[PDB]
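Quick one: co-fold with HHG.
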Amino acid sequence: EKEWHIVPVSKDYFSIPNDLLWSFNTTNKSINVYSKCISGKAVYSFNAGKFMGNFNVKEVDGCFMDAQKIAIDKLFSMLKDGVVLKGNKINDTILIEKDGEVKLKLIRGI
Ligand SMILES: CCCCCC(=O)OC[C@H](O)COP(=O)(O)O
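Sure, here it is.
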């Protein structure tokens, strides 16, 4: 099992909250997200660098600023529509790419 947090690259994501943690279990192929005010378990596909997933999200009312909510909504919508994941052979950082730009990066660890 590996975990990552997001560092936003695109401005649509500058208000994303910092405590979202993304987990991937290699044994059982499970992908979850966890945080104080959000959780989700992914139904997903990942083929040829293309990731698409539905996280079945739960969100705590009133916990987020309007700006955070919009960023969070956009994030899950984008992950549903599909993104390209770019890993590397140096470390476990992964770029999330869509529509010609890097949208965010996944950095290993809490
Ligand atoms: C916020 C980004 C969506 C979460 C998707 C995710 O963390 O995927 C992990 C991926 O399956 C690991 O495979 P890789 O190490 O071969 O790239």
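If it helps, The radius of gyration is 13 Å.
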